[PDB]
Symmetry: C2
Subunit: 133 residues, 2 copies
């Protein structure tokens, strides 16, 4: 089977099982893939999205340990462009309109977020050992 | 080169970069390895070592996403025995005396812990955005 190049991006701050399952889902969209993961910059994430604990270098270094990841673009562009898809020969973007041009090109693949498995969720579990009263 | 079977074990609660680097180090002790990772049970960890946020199923499911891991024994035994090494054909145990019999057998390989990269370390960083006064 032809090798399909998949692109996913995100912040990947305090990487947790939810990120990992989403990367697995993107990697497995076709039988033979190359999964390219883009990691957003510190400045653009903080300006447009929200707070980030870990630096780009930390977030990228953690992601390299994840089996589904074949290539990392770090930092990646904040907005995906058709030129970027051409440059990296990307067949599909795996994402969970401004995705509209991707869907119109047939280059959009849906992935899902998993609830209740995040790093902060784990800290909330720790805190629950301490009754209010 | 002959394939060398490596065994590492631990709790792997809130898996973080430090665990990942230690698994990588064990996987790379020789050029061609099989890295078997043992994940300790909830009851034995809590009784003998300390508190654990995540259940065995959670800790094991997160570990399967780590590229260095070839096999997981979950739950693993709390104490490694020579019979266990024979059963799984383990050549070396990668660990950071009661290791004495392992060193005497020539089956001990040292790995290192990384400081300041744990999950709780990240939460401490979050908290530091809130001045005491």
């Amino acid at each position: 089977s032809k090798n399909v190049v998949i692109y996913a991006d995100g912040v990947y701050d305090m990487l947790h099982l939810g990120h990992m399952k989403q990367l697995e889902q993107a990697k497995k969209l076709f039988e033979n893939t190359t999964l390219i993961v883009g990691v957003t910059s510190d400045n653009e994430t903080k300006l447009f999205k929200g707070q980030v604990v870990q630096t780009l270098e930390e977030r990228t270094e953690t992601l390299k340990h994840i089996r589904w990841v074949d290539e990392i673009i770090s930092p990646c562009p904040w907005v995906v462009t058709p030129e970027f898809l051409e440059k990296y020969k990307i067949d599909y973007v795996a994402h969970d309109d401004i995705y509209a041009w991707l869907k119109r090109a047939g280059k959009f693949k849906a992935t899902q977020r998993t609830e209740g498995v995040s790093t902060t969720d784990l800290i909330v579990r720790i805190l629950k050992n301490y009754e209010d009263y």
